[PDB]
Each structure stands twice: as structure tokens, then as C-alpha cells.
Amino acid sequence: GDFEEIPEEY
Amino acid sequence: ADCGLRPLFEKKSLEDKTERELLESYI
Amino acid sequence: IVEGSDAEIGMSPWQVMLFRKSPQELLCGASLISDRWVLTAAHCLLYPPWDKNFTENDLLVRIGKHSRTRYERNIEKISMLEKIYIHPRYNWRENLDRDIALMKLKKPVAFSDYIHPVCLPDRETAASLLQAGYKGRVTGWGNLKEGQPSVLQVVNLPIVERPVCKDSTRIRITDNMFCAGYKPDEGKRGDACEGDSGGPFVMKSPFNNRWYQMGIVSWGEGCDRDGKYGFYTHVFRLKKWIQKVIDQFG
Numbered sequence: 001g002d003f004e005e006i007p008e009e010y
Numbered sequence: 011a012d013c014g015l016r017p018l019f020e021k022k023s024l025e026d027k028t029e030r031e032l033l034e035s036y037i
Numbered sequence: 038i039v040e041g042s043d044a045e046i047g048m049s050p051w052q053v054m055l056f057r058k059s060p061q062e063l064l065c066g067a068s069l070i071s072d073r074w075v076l077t078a079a080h081c082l083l084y085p086p087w088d089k090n091f092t093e094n095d096l097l098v099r100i101g102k103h104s105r106t107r108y109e110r111n112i113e114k115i116s117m118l119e120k121i122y123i124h125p126r127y128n129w130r131e132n133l134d135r136d137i138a139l140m141k142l143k144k145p146v147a148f149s150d151y152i153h154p155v156c157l158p159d160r161e162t163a164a165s166l167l168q169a170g171y172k173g174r175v176t177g178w179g180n181l182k183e184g185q186p187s188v189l190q191v192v193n194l195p196i197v198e199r200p201v202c203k204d205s206t207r208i209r210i211t212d213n214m215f216c217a218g219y220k221p222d223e224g225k226r227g228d229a230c231e232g233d234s235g236g237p238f239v240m241k242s243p244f245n246n247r248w249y250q251m252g253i254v255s256w257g258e259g260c261d262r263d264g265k266y267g268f269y270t271h272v273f274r275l276k277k278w279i280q281k282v283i284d285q286f287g
């Protein structure tokens with residue numbers, strides 16, 4: 001829930 | 011070959027803050 | 038990790054975070070053992086009592102991390118899984134015996150100041166270092182108590198005598214495990230905890246000044262309880278399986 005978003009590529 | 015040697019520590023001959031605690035227990 | 042401290046930057050550049058894709062959450066710890074192989078605990082991937090059975094496509098490997106939740110742009114590397122290998126005699130039914138699994142990455146990760154593989158022990162380093170009272174180091178982003186850390190946590194813990202390990206639990210202990218932690222009488226504490234699973238217990242060889250992974254965080258009864266100890270998969274004992282897997286599948 002509090003994990004910053006990872007680049008969509010991954 | 012280069013395993014277990016940390017760029018920011020062993021490779022620069024710097025010690026982290028508590029590795030000596032480990033060394034001192036290898037009596 | 039409970040009763041640990043914040044890691045220094047690049048202190049554990051073999052630390053790997055197992056990260057689930059949806060929902061985006063920490064799954065487990067793991068470790069980098071070469072540019073394409075990651076070592077972890079089998080229960081991180083397969084634990085039927087809890088309905089846990091992950092496949093390659095369900096996760097990512099994040100390497101070079103410090104911050105738990107942040108995306109560490111220009112520092113961490115995120116890798117996809119080509120294939121999971123679990124020990125064929127991993128005993129999830131009883132006691133987590135042979136709690137070990139390998140993951141091959143789709144592509145080699147680039148080493149850097151923050152990404153670097155740890156060594157796996159030879160029989161001689163093992164005999165020399167795996168002695169009651171010798172301390173290893175455990176790292177992870179798991180619970181701080183039996184909340185969660187902002188950054189990687191570290192704790193140094195002494196290996197415990199086998200009779201003491203057995204007498205502390207009702208679980209059947211095997212030669213493929215060891216336990217570590219302080220006794221109540223020793224005035225120091227600290228332990229791994231949930232979320233630390235799969236991460237490495239490492240020792241620095243005094244012979245060649247290289248870090249070796251002696252254990253994998255496997256199981257415990259609560260966390261940092263007085264008179265209880267953390268239990269770790271004995272990496273050297275399962276090395277034959279490790280080499281065979283890498284020798285067979287590159």
C-alpha cells in the first residue's frame with residue numbers, strides 16, 4: 001500500500 | 011572471482027561500522 | 038529485523054528484495070550470488086499451508102536497494118524471473134528442512150557500487166566459521182517487532198550451540214539448519230522476523246576478507262523472544278544442489 005510506483009516497463 | 015568484496019568498503023579499504031564485532035568473535 | 042540498526046549505504050550489495058507485482062508488496066528477502074542467480078528461502082515461493090505458490094510471472098527482483106518502499110531511481114535495478122528452482126526435498130509439511138530455492142533472471146544485472154554478489158562457502162570456510170559464538174550478520178526489510186523500517190536493517194548475531202538450538206523448540210531440527218541469537222543472560226538482543234525471510238546470514242572470512250553467505254533466514258517462534266533463536270538454512274550443506282542447478286541450467 002505504501003510502496004512507491006515502479007516504472008510501468010517493469 | 012570478485013564475490014564478497016564490496017565496492018564501497020573492501021574495494022576502497024573502508025570498514026563498515028560493525029564488521030569488527032564479527033572479526034572479534036572469530037576467536 | 039528487530040533490535041537492529043539502519044544499514045550503511047552499499048553495506049550489503051548482494052541484498053535482494055522479492056517484490057510481488059500485484060498488489061505491489063514486499064514478499065521476501067533474497068541474495069545475489071552471480072549476475073543472473075538469486076538465492077532465497079523455498080517457503081518464500083512455496084508454502085501450501087498458507088496457500089502460497091508463486092510463479093515466475095508473479096514477481097520481480099529488486100537489487101541495489103536501501104529504502105524499503107521508495108523507487109530508487111538510478112540505483113536499484115529491477116529484474117524479471119526466467120525460472121524458479123525449489124529444492125526437491127524441501128519439507129514444507131513439517132519443519133522447513135532444506136528451505137532453499139534459486140531464481141535465474143531473464144537477463145544479467147549490471148554490477149555497481151550498490152549491486153555485487155556474495156560468495157558461497159567452500160567446505161573449509163564453513164568448518165572454520167560455523168562455530169558456536171562466531172557472529173554472522175542478517176539483513177532485511179522485515180518487521181521491526183513481532184512496525185516496518187524506512188530502510189534496510191542490519192543485526193549481528195552469534196551462532197548458537199546445536200543442543201541449545203534443539204532445547205529451545207519443539208520443532209525437529211535437522212543438520213540442514215543452524216540457529217543464531219543471544220541468550221537471555223547475554224544482555225544483547227536482536228533477531229530476524231517476518232519479511233526477512235529468504236535474506237542472507239553472512240560472515241566475513243578473516244582469511245581472505247570476503248563475505249560469505251552461511252545461512253538463509255528460514256523460521257523462528259515469534260521474533261526476538263527471550264530463550265528463542267532464529268533458524269537459518271545451512272547453505273554449505275545444500276551446496277551440491279546449488280551447483281548442480283547452476284551447472285545444469287547455466
Ligand SMILES: N=C(N)c1ccc(CNC(=O)[C@@H]2CCCN2C(=O)[C@H](N)C(c2ccccc2)c2ccccc2)cc1
Pocket residue numbers: 080084131132133207208228229230231232233234254255256257258259260261266267268
Ligand atoms: N524470528 C525469526 N528469526 C524468524 C521468524 C519467522 C520467519 C518467517 N518464517 C516463517 O514464518 C515460517 C514459514 C512457515 C511458518 N514459519 C514459522 O517460522 C513458524 N512460526 C514456525 C515453523 C517452523 C517450521 C515449520 C513450520 C512452522 C513455528 C510455528 C509454530 C511453533 C513453532 C515454530 C523468519 C525468521
Ligand code: NA
Pocket residue numbers: 203204205206207208
Ligand atoms: Na526440543
Ligand code: NA
Pocket residue numbers: 218219228261262263264265266
Ligand atoms: Na531470542
